[PDB]
Amino acid sequence: ESHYPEFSWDTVPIAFHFGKSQGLLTKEEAEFVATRSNFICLEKGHATRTHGTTEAGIEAEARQLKNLNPKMKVIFYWNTFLDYSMFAAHKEYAKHPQWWLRTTTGELDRKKGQLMRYDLSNAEFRNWWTNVAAKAVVDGTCDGVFMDAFPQIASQANRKLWGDEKFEAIQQGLQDIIQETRQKIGDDKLIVYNGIRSTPDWSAGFDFAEYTDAAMIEHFGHFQSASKETMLRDILEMQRAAKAGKIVVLKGWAGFTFIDDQAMRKPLTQKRRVAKDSLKFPLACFLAGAQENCYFIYNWGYRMENGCLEWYPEFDKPLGKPVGEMVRDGWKLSREYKHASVRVDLESKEAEIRWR
Structure with a gap:
């Protein structure tokens, strides 16, 4: 409720989720964001070139954004599973090898990129990790924390690495760490997590709701989630979690992603042309199922x-309050809004938005 970002239907409701490593936002970049949204998550690395660590950069950025838009919610990025180097906390985690996660062989468990993975079943480490978040949102200027990598934690493939007994213990430690996060930051702070995920072999809806406020749909219509079946599950889950009072952030991809090597070599006018041309479909999906407190992110x-x-x-046009619930006829969906009509076929991938 009251710790939620201020939500409006006047136009399409937009959130941000990015980092600028080389420095803080310029005044003009911050004004762009602070004017168009009340909801931003600042990524790992933000301003590390000028401010050394992520905590210092994000803290500084939170300050400049909130000076521009006082209702702004600024979310501190803090990975639940992975020991990223570009935080001050990393040099604290380096000194606690008694916590480090190992496989059944004794080898240290690291992901590609020399990233140690956390042993969430370890109570000291959970205490330490939640204190990092509390330093940033309670003592700092942030309004919440973004808890990433839950599907990675839950991946069944971890059973081969850890064993069944440890695998379940880490699953329980994920439940515990969310509870301890809420205890450490308080009730008036946002807990955003990643997330809702629908794929042919493994899916997740909104969970941990006694404690979490917001879930991101990170891979809508892409990666292992591009099928009509997975896009419907995600749209329905947005509809259901939001109707139940949660915040849902749907990440739209602008016709490609940063992981596609060939797409990222295109000239920028091509990237933009693709982005303009790729917007209607995922926007119509969002607007099909969108309820209050639902947010859209669109980029590559x-x-x-x-x-x-x-x-x-499309982000400036009058949208207005929905005037009726989503309608489903097979893979076709429609939604009426006070100033717009939406139709989308998940099977054929067509979409219409009549603004009026």
Whole structure:
């Protein structure tokens, strides 16, 4: 309720989720964001070139954003599973090898990229990890924490690495760490997590709801989630979690992603042309199922450069309150709004938005 970002239907409701490594947002970049949204998650790395660590950069950025828009919610990025290097906390985690997660062989468990993975079943480490978040949102200027990598924690493949007994213990430690996070930051702070995920072999809806406020749909219509079946499950889950009072952030991808090597080599006018042309479909999906407190992100990546500050006329048009619930006829969906009509076929991938 009252710790939620201020939500409106006047236009399409937009959130941001990116980092600018080389520095803080310029005044003009911050004004762009602070004017167009009340909801931003700042990524790992933000301003590390000028401010050394992520905590210092995000703290500084939270301050400049909130000076521009006082209702702004600024979310501190803090990975639940992975020991990223670009935080001050990393040099604290380096000194606690008694916590480090190992496989059944004794080898240290690291992900590609030399990233140690956390032993969430370890109570000291859980205490330490939640204190990092509390330093940033309670003692700092942030309004919440973004808890990433839950599907990675839950992946069954971890059973081969840890064993059944440890695998369940880490699953329980994920439940515990969410509870301890809420205890450490308090009730008036946002807990955003990643997330809702629908794939042919493994899916997740909104969970942990006694404690979490917001879930991100990170891979809508892409990666292992591009099928009509997975896009419907995600749209329905947005509809259901939001109707139940949660915040849902749907990440739309602008016709490609930062992981596609060939797409990222295209000239920027091509990237933008694709982004303009790729917007109607995922926007119509969002607007099909969108309820209150639902947010849309549209770009091709999590770095600023990746289209995060591109804007589109669809984001300025009158939208207005829904005037009826979503309608489903097979893979076809429709939604009426006070100033717009939406139709989308998940099977054929067509979409219409009549503004009026």
